[PDB]
Amino acid sequence: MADPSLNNPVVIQATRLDASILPRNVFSKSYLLYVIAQGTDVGAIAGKANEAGQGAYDAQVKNDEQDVELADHEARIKQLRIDVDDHESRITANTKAITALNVRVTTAEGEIASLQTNVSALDGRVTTAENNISALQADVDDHESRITANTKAITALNVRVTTAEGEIASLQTNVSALDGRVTTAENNISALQADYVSKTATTSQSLASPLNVTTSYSVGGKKVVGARQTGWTAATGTANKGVFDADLTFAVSDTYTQSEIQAIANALITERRRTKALEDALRAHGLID
Amino acid sequence: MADPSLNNPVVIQATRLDASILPRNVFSKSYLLYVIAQGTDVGAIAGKANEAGQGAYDAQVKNDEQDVELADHEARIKQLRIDVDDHESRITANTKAITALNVRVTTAEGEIASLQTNVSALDGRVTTAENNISALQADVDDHESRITANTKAITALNVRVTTAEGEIASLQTNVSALDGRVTTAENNISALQADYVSKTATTSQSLASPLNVTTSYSVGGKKVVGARQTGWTAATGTANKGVFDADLTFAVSDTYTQSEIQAIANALITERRRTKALEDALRAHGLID
Amino acid sequence: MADPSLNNPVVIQATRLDASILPRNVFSKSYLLYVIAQGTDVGAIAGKANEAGQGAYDAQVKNDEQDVELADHEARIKQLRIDVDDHESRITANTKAITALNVRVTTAEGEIASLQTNVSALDGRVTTAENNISALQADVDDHESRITANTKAITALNVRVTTAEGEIASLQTNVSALDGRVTTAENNISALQADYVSKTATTSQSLASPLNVTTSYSVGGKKVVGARQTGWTAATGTANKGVFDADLTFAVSDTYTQSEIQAIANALITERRRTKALEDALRAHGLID
Ligand SMILES: [Ca+2]
Ligand SMILES: [Cl-]
Ligand SMILES: [Cl-]
């Protein structure tokens, strides 16, 4: 460290030299040009050897407050170094984060503006949709208000069709019924014209049957027959269908002749028998009783 | 500071002594040698306090030169930990903000990847919907092509059904007009068959009325009756409808007999009354005038 | 740079003034003490100046070791600011770049938050349109059934009206054809009305024809005119339809002087002439053959 002894003065120098008292008798002048000078030189060398060690201590005691402030330095540096070195790994790490973050920010911002245009695209896409759906519900509303009016007038014309369809058969069975009714009538009229007598024809009409009339038969507007006459007694006798002559019963004379009255009586007999068979006619027919 | 006074030596008067200066007689040999060896030492001891004070000065120059290059290191060491304190407050405020940026950023694409899976799912939910819309029109768009096909038939049918009901209204009016005639026409033909005289029936027919005829009355194909004859004059007298003699005979005598001639005139009378009666009955019927 | 020349001392004489060597009566005690003490001081100044320069040399060699650690003191601190100056360049890069990344992130987080409030309303715009679509899908499924039902209605409505339209027309002929045949009939009917001969007629009838019947004409219920009579022989003679009387024209007296027999003879032959006329009349009419 330091030496304090250095700072301890040796100065003595007990005595200062004078002559007297020294053998100035036994000495040459020159030993006295030495012995007084030797004493002064010895004493000046001491004080100088003393000052040499005062300054040697001051230089030693400075070196000891230098080494103490060297050692305070040596420490303040090492903790300044251990600090920059740790600050180093810490900044090197702080940037390493900033650089691998900005990449997380860039991958974000890039998807967002993509997401931004992948959003308002879907909004546009649903607006087309929305506007369609509403029109589709505008048409379906019109379609429902129509189909039903179609169904309603289909029912309304079906009840007019099934009516006529059943009235058609009514007429069609009225026509075929009247068809049989017409043909038998026209056939009965054809026969009725064949078997009937007309007030209008000359062509002689032949009955297969007897005839009856109320009062008189007639021709030309004159009465030709009447009721069978009454009151008759039937003439009996012999009916003469033989020859009949109108001759004079003659020879009537002035004298009685038997042969003529015999003729007149025989021209009576035979005249009565015509009138008898002329009566046999009017009876057989029935014109008289 | 330091002392420049130490480079200053002290000069000495004492110097090497020849035997001439010394008192050979007075001093012992050993004290003779001591005094000559004195000046050596006395002079050589000087050569140190000289050389010590030099190196004491030379050590105070190298000292004071170090002292300013110490405190130079100190202004540097005090300025260094000063800027290093400006190091440590910054990096730890840099690393506290580094983890605030990692948390924010993680929340960034946490929401992005949600934004990304919704937009993708809504695209899938849109691509399904507009698919359904595309056909939804295709259905509806054809529907009104059918509705206008249906509704048109409806009007086309309602016009064809109407004209059919107008016709049938006319038909049914005239099937009841006809069926009201043929029935009457079957009524008048029914009264005709009861009221007519016929050619076919064998049994006797009859009239409630007087009958007239033209030019003839016939039976069996032969004409039995005909027109009335007008040339007649009325036969007068009394008519005899009573008993008429059957084969009345007369027996005549050769000589005149009154009673025999009386009977012949009487049978002339009666038979003249018989011929008057046939004609009187004939004029009653009207066969003659 | 140390001078070891200050680490070596003086060698001084071993003998110091034993006084065995000192001048006997020559020196006064005044000078006897000085000389003796001057031997003790001189030898003392040496062994100090020896260590007064031993200190300086030790205040030098230490300063040498002081200059070697200062060399390491500067060579460190130079590096200390060499890596520190790089720090505040690399920290101010760390700190200013921290601020550039935030302002991108702050913006980025708020344009997402607007992106999520837009897409949360999309999800419900898609879903509402999702709900109005299948409501249309089912309504259209209901619309398809109803239309097919509607068009199977009119197709079968069409098959009925045509089958009906042709049914009316054939019916439209057969009614006016029936109208004809009835008019033909009912016209021939009224002919039979004004012409045919009645059984029940009251007023006297007429015929433009000769009548002929098969067996018996009758009037009143009894046979009057039947088939003509045969077996007759045509009477030869003349006829008299003139004046006639049934009167008694023949007188008989009791004698024959005169012919009044010719009066009975003339009345028999005017009577046979009526009986001829009465026979003719029945022959002309046809009643007799
Ligand atoms: Ca120093
Ligand atoms: Cl429809
Ligand atoms: Cl940093």
Cβ of A69 within 8 Å of Cβ of B70? The answer is yes
Cα(B191)–Cα(C107) distance, rounded to whole angstroms? Answer: 122
Chain B touched by A51 (CB under 8 Å): yes
Question: Out of C182, C206, C261, whose CB is closest to B181?
Answer: C182
CA angle A258, A263, A268 (to 5 degrees): 130
Long-range pairs, B143-149, Cβ under 8 A, ≥24: B143/A139, B143/A143, B143/C140, B143/C143, B143/C147, B144/A139, B144/A142, B144/A143, B146/C147, B146/C151, B147/A143, B147/A146, B147/A147, B147/A150, B147/C147, B149/C151
Q: What is the enclosing helix (H) or strand (E) of A154? A: helix A120-194
DSSP string across B200-225 = S--S----SS---BSS-EEETTEEEE
- Are the C-beta atoms of residues C282 and A224 closer than 8 Å to each other? no
In this complex, which chains have at least 3 CB pairs below 8 Å with chain A? Answer: B, C
Would you say how long chain C is, in residues?
289
For residue C226 the two structure tokens come to: 């039947």
Cα(C119)–Cα(A123) distance, rounded to whole angstroms? Answer: 8
Residues 59-98 of B with CB under 8 A from C: 59, 62-63, 66, 69-70, 73, 76-77, 80, 83-84, 86-87, 90-91, 93-94, 97-98
Would you say how long chain B is, in residues?
289
- The upper half-sphere exposure of residue A148, i.e. CA atoms within 13 Å in the direction of its Cβ, equals 7
Packed helices C261-269 and C272-285: angle between N→C axes, nearest 10 degrees: 0
DSSP label at residue C213? E
Q: What is the enclosing helix (H) or strand (E) of B77? A: helix B71-96
In angstroms, what CA-CA distances link B158 with A161, A228, B162, C152, C170?
A: 10, 82, 6, 16, 22
> Other C-beta atoms within 10 Å of B276: how many?
22
- The upper half-sphere exposure of residue C126, i.e. CA atoms within 13 Å in the direction of its Cβ, equals 23
Query: In this structure, which amino acid lies at residue B100?
Result: A
Cα(B112)–Cα(C111) distance, rounded to whole angstroms? Answer: 11
Reduce the DSSP state of residue B288 to 3 states and report it: strand
CB neighbour burial string for A228-243, b if at least 16 within 10 angstroms, e if fewer: bbeebeebebebbeee
In angstroms, what CA-CA distances link B63 with A11, C61, C159?
A: 27, 12, 140
- Are the C-beta atoms of residues C118 and A119 closer than 8 Å to each other? yes
In this complex, which chains have at least 3 CB pairs below 8 Å with chain B? Answer: A, C
Burial class, C13, CB count within 10 angstroms (exposed 0-12 / middle 13-18 / buried 19+): middle
Question: Out of A50, A116, A130, whose CB is closest to C115?
Answer: A116
The beta strand positions in chain B, using DSSP E, are: 217-219, 222-225, 235-236
**B238 domain-assigned:** yes
- Are the C-beta atoms of residues B59 and A52 closer than 8 Å to each other? no
Among B211, B30, B147, B252, residue whose Cα is nearest residue C154: B147
Resolution of this structure in Å: 2.7
- Are the C-beta atoms of residues A19 and C28 closer than 8 Å to each other? no
Q: What is the enclosing helix (H) or strand (E) of C151? A: helix C122-195
In angstroms, what CA-CA distances link C87 with B99, B197, B287, C73, C97?
A: 21, 160, 185, 21, 15
Among B280, B250, B283, residue whose Cα is nearest residue B268: B250
> Other C-beta atoms within 10 Å of C36: how many?
17
Among B187, B186, B180, residue whose Cα is nearest residue A174: B180
Structural biology method used: X-ray
Distance B166 CA to ligand 2 centre (A): 27
Q: What is the enclosing helix (H) or strand (E) of A75? A: helix A35-117
**C169 domain-assigned:** no
For residue B1 the two structure tokens come to: 């500071």
Cβ of A246 within 8 Å of Cβ of C108? The answer is no
Cα(C227)–Cα(B221) distance, rounded to whole angstroms? Answer: 9
- Counting runs of H as helices and runs of E as strands, what totals does chain B give? 7, 3
**C63 domain-assigned:** yes
**B11 domain-assigned:** yes
The beta strand positions in A137-270, using DSSP E, are: 205-206, 211-213, 217-219, 222-225
Among C62, C151, C263, residue whose Cα is nearest residue B264: C263
Among A243, B33, B19, B28, residue whose Cα is nearest residue C232: A243
Cβ of A219 within 8 Å of Cβ of B218? The answer is no
DSSP string across A13-39 = ------SSSS-TTTS-TTTTTTHHHHH
Distance B132 CA to ligand 2 centre (A): 23
Q: For residue A288, what are the β-bridge partners? A: A229
CA angle B252, B254, B259 (to 5 degrees): 50
Q: How far is B197 from chain A (nearest CA, A)?
A: 6
Taking the CA atoms of residue B142, residue B148, residue B149 and residue B154 in that order, the dihedral angle to the nearest 10 degrees is 150
Cα(B112)–Cα(B61) distance, rounded to whole angstroms? Answer: 76
- Are the C-beta atoms of residues A243 and C234 closer than 8 Å to each other? no
Cβ of C157 within 8 Å of Cβ of B157? The answer is yes
Asked, as a colleague might, if the bond just before C133 is cis with ω within 30 of 0, I would say no
Cβ of B195 within 8 Å of Cβ of C200? The answer is yes
In angstroms, what CA-CA distances link C132 with A122, B104, B136, B223?
A: 18, 41, 11, 113
Range of the domain at A249: 217-284
Distance B103 CA to ligand 1 centre (A): 58
The beta strand positions in C94-253, using DSSP E, are: 211-213, 217-219, 222-223, 244-245
Counting the structural domains of chain B, the total is 2
In angstroms, what CA-CA distances link B142 with B106, C135, C148, C160?
A: 54, 18, 13, 28
Q: How far is A157 from chain C (nearest CA, A)?
A: 9
Chain C residues with CB inside 8 Å of A108's CB?
Answer: 108
Cα(B90)–Cα(C87) distance, rounded to whole angstroms? Answer: 11
CA angle C236, C239, C243 (to 5 degrees): 160
- Are the C-beta atoms of residues B14 and B42 closer than 8 Å to each other? yes
Q: For residue B176, what are the β-bridge partners? A: none
Q: Which residue of A lies nearest to B288 if distances are taken between CA atoms? A: A224
Q: For residue A229, what are the β-bridge partners? A: A288
Residues 225-284 of C with CB under 8 A from B: 225-228, 241-248, 250, 252-256, 261, 264, 267-268, 271, 274-275, 278, 281, 284
- Are the C-beta atoms of residues A5 and C51 closer than 8 Å to each other? yes
Cα(A217)–Cα(C218) distance, rounded to whole angstroms? Answer: 9
Q: Which residue of B lies nearest to A276 if distances are taken between CA atoms? A: B244
Dihedrals phi, psi of C2, to nearest 5 degrees: -110, 140
Cα(A32)–Cα(A17) distance, rounded to whole angstroms? Answer: 11
The beta strand positions in chain C, using DSSP E, are: 211-213, 217-219, 222-223, 244-245
CB neighbour burial string for B44-54, b if at least 16 within 10 angstroms, e if fewer: ebbebbbbbbb
Among B81, C236, C228, residue whose Cα is nearest residue A76: B81
Would you say how long chain A is, in residues?
289
Q: Is B16 left (phi over 0), alpha (psi -120 to 50) or beta?
A: beta
Chain C touched by B215 (CB under 8 Å): yes
Reduce the DSSP state of residue A12 to 3 states and report it: coil
* CATH, residue C45: 1.20.5.340
Q: Which residue of A lies nearest to C212 if distances are taken between CA atoms? A: A206
Q: Which residue of A lies nearest to B60 if distances are taken between CA atoms? A: A59
**C197 domain-assigned:** no
Strand B222-225 with B217-219, pairing: antiparallel
Chain A touched by C193 (CB under 8 Å): no
Chain C residues with CB inside 8 Å of A165's CB?
Answer: 160, 164
- Are the C-beta atoms of residues B122 and A125 closer than 8 Å to each other? no
Query: In this structure, which amino acid lies at residue B207?
Result: L
β-sheet with A205-206: strand ranges across: A205-206, C211-213, B217-219, B222-225
Cα(A197)–Cα(B198) distance, rounded to whole angstroms? Answer: 7
CB neighbour burial string for B62-95, b if at least 16 within 10 angstroms, e if fewer: bbeebeeebeebeebbeebeeebeebeebbeebb
Question: Out of A140, A164, A202, whose CB is closest to C208?
Answer: A202
DSSP label at residue B179? T
Residues 5-24 of A with CB under 8 A from B: 23
DSSP label at residue A229? B
CA angle C20, C22, C26 (to 5 degrees): 145
> Which residue of C94, C148, C215 is the best one to mutate when testing the B interface, meaning the one whose CB has the most B CBs within 10 A?
C94
Q: For residue A211, what are the β-bridge partners? A: C217
Breaks (C-N over 2.5 A) in chain A follow: none
Question: Out of C90, C157, C273, whose CB is closest to A157?
Answer: C157
Asked, as a colleague might, if the bond just before A13 is cis with ω within 30 of 0, I would say yes
> Of B68, B96, B124, which marks where a domain is finished?
B96
CA B211, B215, B221, B225 torsion-angle sign? positive
First and final C-alpha spacing in chain C: 225
Strand A205-206 with C244-245, pairing: unpaired
Residues 6+ apart with CB under 8 A from A12: A46, C41
Cα(C14)–Cα(B37) distance, rounded to whole angstroms? Answer: 11
**B133 domain-assigned:** no
- Are the C-beta atoms of residues A264 and A226 closer than 8 Å to each other? no
Cα(C21)–Cα(A289) distance, rounded to whole angstroms? Answer: 268
Residues 6+ apart with CB under 8 A from A57: A2, A3, A4, A6, A7, C55
DSSP label at residue C6? G
Q: Is B220 left (phi over 0), alpha (psi -120 to 50) or beta?
A: left
- Are the C-beta atoms of residues C211 and B219 closer than 8 Å to each other? no
Distance B110 CA to ligand 3 centre (A): 27
Q: Which residue of C lies nearest to A193 if distances are taken between CA atoms? A: C192
- The upper half-sphere exposure of residue A74, i.e. CA atoms within 13 Å in the direction of its Cβ, equals 12
Chain A residues with CB inside 8 Å of B115's CB?
Answer: 112, 115, 119
> Of C82, C100, C116, which marks where a domain is finished?
C116
**B55 domain-assigned:** yes
> Other C-beta atoms within 10 Å of A125: how many?
18
Reduce the DSSP state of residue B192 to 3 states and report it: helix
Asked, as a colleague might, if the bond just before A134 is cis with ω within 30 of 0, I would say no
Q: How far is C246 from chain B (nearest CA, A)?
A: 5
Chain C residues with CB inside 8 Å of A88's CB?
Answer: 83, 87
Residues 6+ apart with CB under 8 A from A99: none
Chain B touched by A219 (CB under 8 Å): yes
Residue for token pair 């004379």 = A253
* Cβ contacts from A onto C, under 8 A: 401
Long-range pairs, B181-190, Cβ under 8 A, ≥24: B181/C182, B181/C186, B182/A178, B182/A181, B182/A182, B182/A185, B182/C182, B183/A181, B185/A185, B185/C182, B185/C185, B185/C186, B185/C189, B186/A181, B186/A185, B188/C189, B188/C193, B189/A185, B189/A188, B189/A189, B189/A192, B189/C189
DSSP string across A108-123 = HHHHHHHHHHTTHHHH
> Other C-beta atoms within 10 Å of B147: how many?
19
> Other C-beta atoms within 10 Å of C83: how many?
13
Cα(A60)–Cα(C55) distance, rounded to whole angstroms? Answer: 7
CA B36, B41, B44, B45 torsion-angle sign? negative
Chain B residues with CB inside 8 Å of A80's CB?
Answer: 77, 80-81, 84
Among A222, A266, A275, A225, residue whose Cα is nearest residue A247: A266
- Are the C-beta atoms of residues B224 and B234 closer than 8 Å to each other? no
Cα(C27)–Cα(C36) distance, rounded to whole angstroms? Answer: 11
Query: In this structure, which amino acid lies at residue C89?
Result: S
**A71 domain-assigned:** yes
> Of B96, B131, B151, which marks where a domain is finished?
B96
CA angle B89, B95, B98 (to 5 degrees): 140
Query: In this structure, which amino acid lies at residue C259?
Result: S
In angstroms, what CA-CA distances link C59 with A5, A170, B234, C1, C285?
A: 14, 161, 237, 12, 224
Reduce the DSSP state of residue B229 to 3 states and report it: strand
- The upper half-sphere exposure of residue A154, i.e. CA atoms within 13 Å in the direction of its Cβ, equals 23
Query: In this structure, which amino acid lies at residue A44?
Result: A
For residue C268 the two structure tokens come to: 């028999």
> Which residue of A22, A86, A219 is the best one to mutate when testing the B interface, meaning the one whose CB has the most B CBs within 10 A?
A219
Residues 6+ apart with CB under 8 A from C210: A202, A204, A205, B213, B214, B215, B216, B217, B218, B223
Cα(B115)–Cα(C50) distance, rounded to whole angstroms? Answer: 95
CB neighbour burial string for B103-133, b if at least 16 within 10 angstroms, e if fewer: ebbeebbebbeebeebbeebeebbeebbebb
Query: In this structure, which amino acid lies at residue A237?
Result: G
- Are the C-beta atoms of residues A28 and B23 closer than 8 Å to each other? yes
- Are the C-beta atoms of residues C36 and C17 closer than 8 Å to each other? yes
Query: In this structure, which amino acid lies at residue A87?
Result: H
* Cβ contacts from B onto C, under 8 A: 383
Residues 6+ apart with CB under 8 A from B132: C133, C134, C137
Q: How far is A251 from chain B (nearest CA, A)?
A: 16
